[PDB]
């Protein structure tokens, strides 16, 4: 946004730029284009004994 | 005497623009707006960089 303030010496321009947070968007893209997030795999122990559960 | 003149004109100028609702004479027809004053404080006289930065804003 841009404004012209009319003082007694002359016009004072006022620019304002606001970068909103992409996470709080709720409408459209939630992140910047090159944001990549790899989800951490939940780590579990190797079984080393073959078993069958039954029903 | 000149100071007298200046002050008197100032007071009269208060009086004419008392009736007229907005800014300058003739108001919104006028095409000329009412200007304001920049409160600089003491920031820019003999202009330089400001040692006294402000930590917080009211």
Curated annotation (Swiss-Prot), chain A:
**Where is it predominantly found?**
cytoplasm
Keyword RNA-binding present in the record's keywords: the answer is yes
Arranged from A to Z, the UniProt key words for this protein are: Cytoplasm, Isopeptide bond, Methylation, Phosphoprotein, Ribonucleoprotein, Ribosomal protein, RNA-binding, Ubl conjugation
Kindly list the GO molecular function terms attached to this UniProt entry. Answer: DNA-(apurinic or apyrimidinic site) endonuclease activity; RNA binding; structural constituent of ribosome
UniProt's post-translational modification comment states: Ubiquitinated at Lys-42 in response to stalled ribosomes. Ubiquitination leads to activation of the No-Go Decay (NGD) pathway and degradation of non-functional 18S rRNA: first monoubiquitinated at Lys-42 by MAG2, followed by formation of 'Lys-63'-linked polyubiquitin chains on monoubiquitin by HEL2 and RSP5.
Q: Which GO terms describe its cellular component?
A: 90S preribosome; cytoplasm; cytosol; cytosolic small ribosomal subunit; nucleus; preribosome, small subunit precursor
Effect after changing residue 42 to R: Abolishes ubiquitination by HEL2
| A GO BP entry | ribosomal subunit export from nucleus
Recorded superkingdom: Eukaryota
Residues folding into a coiled coil are none
The record's subcellular location field reads: Cytoplasm
- Which positions bear Phosphoserine? 51
Glycyl lysine isopeptide (Lys-Gly) (interchain with G-Cter in ubiquitin), cross-linked positions: 30, 42
Determine if Cytoplasm is one of this entry's keywords: yes
Q: What else is known?
A: Present with 146000 molecules/cell in log phase SD medium.
What does the record note on quaternary structure? Component of the small ribosomal subunit (SSU). Mature yeast ribosomes consist of a small (40S) and a large (60S) subunit. The 40S small subunit contains 1 molecule of ribosomal RNA (18S rRNA) and 33 different proteins (encoded by 57 genes). The large 60S subunit contains 3 rRNA molecules (25S, 5.8S and 5S rRNA) and 46 different proteins (encoded by 81 genes).
Function, as annotated, reads: Component of the ribosome, a large ribonucleoprotein complex responsible for the synthesis of proteins in the cell. The small ribosomal subunit (SSU) binds messenger RNAs (mRNAs) and translates the encoded message by selecting cognate aminoacyl-transfer RNA (tRNA) molecules. The large subunit (LSU) contains the ribosomal catalytic site termed the peptidyl transferase center (PTC), which catalyzes the formation of peptide bonds, thereby polymerizing the amino acids delivered by tRNAs into a polypeptide chain.
Q: Which family does it belong to?
A: Belongs to the universal ribosomal protein uS3 family.
- Protein name in the entry: Small ribosomal subunit protein uS3
List the top taxonomic levels of the source.
Eukaryota, Fungi, Dikarya, Ascomycota, Saccharomycotina
Gene name of the encoded protein:
RPS3
Residue window of the full protein shown: 171 to 225 of 240
Swiss-Prot record, chain B:
Assign the protein's first listed, main location to one coarse class: cytoplasm
Q: Name one GO cellular component term.
A: eukaryotic 48S preinitiation complex
Q: What ranges does the record give for the region Disordered, renumbered to this chain? A: 20-58
Which of UniProt's keywords are assigned here?
A: Cytoplasm, Initiation factor, Methylation, Phosphoprotein, Protein biosynthesis
Compartments it resides in: Cytoplasm
> What sections of the sequence does the record tag as coiled-coil?
none
Q: Which residues carry this modification: Omega-N-methylarginine?
A: 21
How is loss of this gene reflected in the phenotype of the organism? Marked reduction in binding of the eIF-3 core complex to 40S ribosomes.
GO-annotated molecular function: translation initiation factor activity
Q: Provide the GO biological process annotations.
A: cytoplasmic translation; formation of cytoplasmic translation initiation complex; maturation of SSU-rRNA from tricistronic rRNA transcript (SSU-rRNA, 5.8S rRNA, LSU-rRNA); nuclear-transcribed mRNA catabolic process, nonsense-mediated decay
TM regions (residue ranges): none
UniProt KW Ligase keyword: no
Q: What else is known?
A: Present with 17900 molecules/cell in log phase SD medium.
Q: Could you say which protein family the record assigns here?
A: Belongs to the eIF-3 subunit J family.
Quaternary structure per UniProt? Probable component of the eukaryotic translation initiation factor 3 (eIF-3) complex. Is not part of the eIF-3 core complex, with which it is associated in substochiometric amounts.
Function of the molecule:
Component of the eukaryotic translation initiation factor 3 (eIF-3) complex, which is involved in protein synthesis of a specialized repertoire of mRNAs and, together with other initiation factors, stimulates binding of mRNA and methionyl-tRNAi to the 40S ribosome. The eIF-3 complex specifically targets and initiates translation of a subset of mRNAs involved in cell proliferation.
Q: In its UniProt entry, what is this protein called?
A: Eukaryotic translation initiation factor 3 subunit J
The record lists the organism as Saccharomyces cerevisiae (strain ATCC 204508 / S288c) (Baker's yeast)
Q: What is the gene called?
A: HCR1
């Amino acid at each position: 946004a841009t404004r012209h303030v009319l003082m007694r010496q002359g016009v004072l321009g006022i620019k304002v730029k606001i970068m909103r947070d992409p996470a709080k968007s709720r409408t459209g893209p939630k992140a910047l284009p090159d944001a990549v997030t790899i989800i951490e795999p939940k780590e579990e122990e190797p079984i080393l004994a073959p078993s069958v559960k039954d029903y | 005497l000149n100071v007298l003149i200046k002050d008197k004109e100032r007071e009269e100028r208060q009086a004419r623009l008392a009736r007229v609702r907005g800014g300058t004479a003739t108001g919104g027809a006028g095409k000329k707006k009412v200007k304001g004053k920049t409160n600089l404080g003491g920031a820019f006289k003999k202009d330089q960089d400001f040692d006294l930065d402000g930590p917080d804003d009211f």
